[PDB]
Symmetry: none
Subunit: 152 residues, 12 copies
């Protein structure tokens, strides 16, 4: 087993730890990255005084290039975030691909300050989270994810 299976208690404790740290930052709004992002996002929305939750969904297709992928925003976020402390919540920063796209949609809305929180991150990511709990190189199977079946 070269995969990491995070339990729900591991995710709850991780979220509680992040919360205490995000309290010093005082977020005005949360932006959850779908789909895994929305678990920590919803919980943080509650734990931090029911602060507004915005949802964004970024998806990737192969497009007209073989070596390359262009982002298609499934679920957008609206309204402006001028003078608003923003905190983007996602489950893990693997390549940082999705996060970079999200940081650009948050700036287009005039985000005052921007912080990034994740449950875990991988060493090579191009977007290190400002706050995270787990560090690993393996593939992470979260408590809310199903398992693949191996057939002959």
């Amino acid at each position: 087993m070269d995969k990491v299976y995070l339990t729900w208690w591991q995710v709850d404790r991780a979220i509680f730890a992040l919360a205490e740290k995000l309290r010093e930052y005082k977020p005005d709004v949360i932006i959850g990255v779908a789909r895994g992002g929305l678990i920590p996002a919803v919980r943080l929305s509650h734990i931090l005084g029911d602060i507004p939750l915005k949802v964004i969904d970024v998806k990737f297709y192969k497009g007209i290039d073989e070596r390359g992928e262009k982002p298609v925003i499934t679920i957008p976020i609206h309204g402006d975030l001028k003078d608003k402390r923003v905190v983007i919540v996602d489950d893990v920063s693997d390549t940082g691909k999705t996060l970079e796209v999200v940081i650009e949609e948050v700036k287009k809305l005039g985000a005052k300050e921007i912080k990034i929180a994740c449950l875990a991150m991988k060493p090579w990511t191009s977007v290190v989270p400002d706050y995270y709990v787990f560090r690993t190189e393996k593939w992470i199977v979260f408590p809310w994810e199903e398992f693949p079946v191996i057939e002959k």
Copy 2:
């Protein structure tokens, strides 16, 4: 006790059970109600074969309470079989706002699935697992603390 504190497992086993019954329905799109609907919708979305996911947020503001659409449903739903997902149908006040909002978009067929439902609701879910009148604390919600006064 005064409240029901649903564990992640109990909610997960309910999402699976709900998914099994929703296969027969074959949803084209899943509409999750913010915020209690989100987690369940995420899991059902993938279990049902990575079907498209949409979000809708309804807040009520105070004489009298008027509903506000925090996050509107993007795109249209013409000819699509829709499924509105929520954690619980309590009064059915939010669900009724969603139902109409989906109808504006052109859902071929609308179906509602909830983890729980309360006997006195005005919107009986087409699919639900838990039934109670008690105060329900879902795993993603904060455990309320009672203080003095």
Copy 3:
């Protein structure tokens, strides 16, 4: 069961118990919110020395929702010790409107008495007997019948 069916006696004994504690407060006026509060207001009114009885009716219409005063209360209660009587404090929405209307009559001190209250209400009664989350059918209400859809 799914509902609590309070018998006339259980309610009579609660009204008696509430009067016993309301003596110390020495009410000058009793505001019974119809319709659930009227029968209890009538009895407390007499037990407490035949004190003046006023009535208020608040109805909530749908089309958001705004409250409409079906039966308004009049006459200033300047420096009068008022007691608001109702059958139950459920969400607290009605009792909040009744409080606003009593204060509009210049009420000195306001106390609230109910036979029952639900743990999630916004207006906890200064006096109550029954505490539950279940569906409450008071003796004066009709016993609901469940019919197939």
Copy 4:
């Protein structure tokens, strides 16, 4: 014991009986006459498909503050084009029902009907619908008892 002590089950049954006769009349609004008149008026409001309830309070004072019938709680909104039913616990002399009847007409009531739990042989206002007849004083389920002290 020269008094008639009505149980809640007698009051409940008397109310279900009045409901059946009242369905035929198809009341549009109920006017409850305080105080004991509210118990029956409320119950009928529910049984008859939640028809709107209005309250009227009539008080006959005697010896300060008194001259003739005073209307403690008035009824408002016109009843123009409405079938009205006036509910009270008992029509003893009818002094009260008469004043109420006058306030209703004074509001334009399309038609008027009277229903009570009981009535006494000497009333000047015989209810269109009622259940008990007696000359004794009635102690309803919702009333307290006086105590007899030596003195």
Copy 5:
């Protein structure tokens, strides 16, 4: 108010009273006379060790709306009715029970009036007024 309005607590205590007296008799079966009679019949049925219950309905002339079958041969019977007013119905019931050859026959009622032609073997209330039972509805007086 020239009527007697029995409460459920009066009816319940009447039954418990009857039951203790009926235990000395040891009924093998109970014959309940619809309609008001079923109430006491049912209660005595459970109270007396869940003994068999047969329902007989007599309407008036005399036509049996609900017949009782089987033979009460060598079976001590107790006929349960709410009130023995004139005795008319009860006398008809006494027949059908003998026709089935009952080892013995006893009658138990809640009430009974002075003039009845059939005095119950066991009863509780005696009156001359009309009895309105807990399970009955009330008439309305109109103009």
Copy 6:
């Protein structure tokens, strides 16, 4: 029917009536006269701030009637306001035996509260609610059965 059958609601409302008068008296202890007497005694005990309850049982024998105390009053009653409670004062014979037993325990003051009284009783209660000449069947009493001779 030549008997008066008192319901529990009649008995409760009587006891509540008696209680409000006994509050002006502020009794220190209650002497409940078994057996029927024990129902209103226990209730008044609870209604008047759990004031202590003592029990007394008086039986009569064919006087060659002579009284016999089955259950005596424990302790003494020096400097305490007393209230003797019974269901009904019929002849007054029982109450008289009790008034005497109370006095010889040195009761400061003495009061008598009954549910009912009959016109010819020798001991008129200081407080009562029902007056009748008929035999009274209380809510806690069973009925006799009329068999054939």
Copy 7:
């Protein structure tokens, strides 16, 4: 509590409530499932217009098999029937009655019960109380736990 002890008054109010709904159905006949359904039937009979009252009694003896101790008399052809029982728990007694009522060929069939348990195989058409707990009806004897 372990059990539910319905009072005469509660039962009576349920009956009045059921009757109000049953009016729209205009029953031609009422069949009281004995013994529990009898008392409710009697009242429903008078309340709906002194409509005919038939009685049925199905006893289960021990696998197991039913024994109709008191069969329904006459035929119900072209008649709208209403079966009345105190509670629909398992539903085994009612199913044996729905059939027996079809034999006599009934026009329409609706079931009216005071109570109903969630796991019942026979969800009545009209009911008031809903519980999973042990129900003790007024006419039944209060159970006593001994050692």
Copy 8:
């Protein structure tokens, strides 16, 4: 709800049921326990053939701060060759009943039997006869309906 409010009727019916099961026992004396079982004992006494009624009252006094039990209303004489029935309203913790039992045993009861209307699972004294079973707060008909104030 938070509490169970038994009606007089529910209590009367339970008393009848207990009486019926007690008939086989054939009690000689009924020892009502104050204050809860007084009313039930009064009724049981008559129903079971006017058998003599005795009363015992046990109170707990807090020392100057535990709790010590003291007999407020004693039982005179003895209970030799007498089949007894101790009647109470409910057997919650069983503390009271245990004291009443020791006293009854000291008076030489031939046989003892406990009968209560209610019983709580965690009790140290399971009644020999009982009807209601719950863990909730029980308000008997003879008690005051509790009011909650701020």
Copy 9:
């Protein structure tokens, strides 16, 4: 709520508790009824010293309704102390069969152990933990879903 959803851990703690009490009984063989008792019996099998595990499956078919032993017990249980393991003793019909069936194999002593039991069962387990009248959904069963008929 309307149903009880025992978690794996709750069931596990129950099994450990039962195992501890059985240690005194020293069971020779464990008989799990299918399918509810299988999982519990496996754990108790190992915990109690890797004692042999036999299986029995009783199903009920309608016409009346009688039992059919889908999986009989293998071997004989002479002079052995037996322990029947089941998830819940609801009505007791299933266990009654299993008992006769085990008695046929001539068991020295028979003992019943379940996780749960209902008040009305005709077969009170010798060892149980949970007690309820509600619908019990064990971890191995599926979470029922309610759909609109």
Copy 10:
């Protein structure tokens, strides 16, 4: 059911919720009542900033009398104390502890519990669960009913 069986996760979420409120009270010391309050005290201790931890064990043995098996060590003069326990049932154990804490001159005292029963004489300043049922906590052994 007859008893409530709180899971480790439910207790842990209660403790996390409780800690958030206790943050506003700025405790100086935590007194964990044995044995039930020890586990929640340990965790609360750490979460609130490793604030010192005292332990007290009160047992009950003519009549019933409280005995302190483990006394609090040190003094609490001027300290803002927090007494931690699993459940406030009757309230008799918490009463003895409040007295013992005062004997050490505690300035402010607060009581934090996971659960509380409605008839308790010591209503907690902070609690999560409310019920009258028999509460089995994760650390207690599941009770087995035998014959």
Copy 11:
């Protein structure tokens, strides 16, 4: 710690995944191999429309296999599915396949939660692949004494 400790949520999720593949196969009967096998067997039994469940137990003595809990009845024209916790050597699974064939199994499929790479019986469906010993949620632990 050299062992793999599997949680109940892992076992449940693995079972739900297996069941979704087994629906395409539409089994008629499930054969759970005692003892650990009965866990997933019982669960799949319910998940797949309560299809019948037979139990088989294979022990070994010196090796020579002995069936301690035989499965009776026939599987003629019945797509069978054998369920177990883990396929290690495959030793036991082979003895089970033989017994299933000896009863007329129309088709045979094997579903396991896990499998070691060196097994002689690679399951048609499995979820976990490991070389370490696996401790399942229903298993007790050894105490290292002195």
Copy 12:
């Protein structure tokens, strides 16, 4: 992830396993080592027939030991068992053993959930072995910032 995250179910089973071994020993009293050690100690206190529990708390800042919560009473003629979560260096357990001897403990046994290879004090009963930092079910997690 170079840390080991124990679950409550792993701890519960560890505790149950240890408990069966401790029944052979029959402890008179248990000595829980705060703080993580209280979890096992309380649990064992209950499982082993509610035997008396005592709490001790040692702290360090060379590295001098500071007893934050002492124990008292004579453990004369009493078989004692010290319970801790993990025996890493053996540092705390040496102090605790000292405190128990000063009370004249008849026999002393040590029981931990886990232990590490280099410990100066090897538990008489333990379940897990590791060289990694163990994160218990009741502990919080550190957050990594920039």
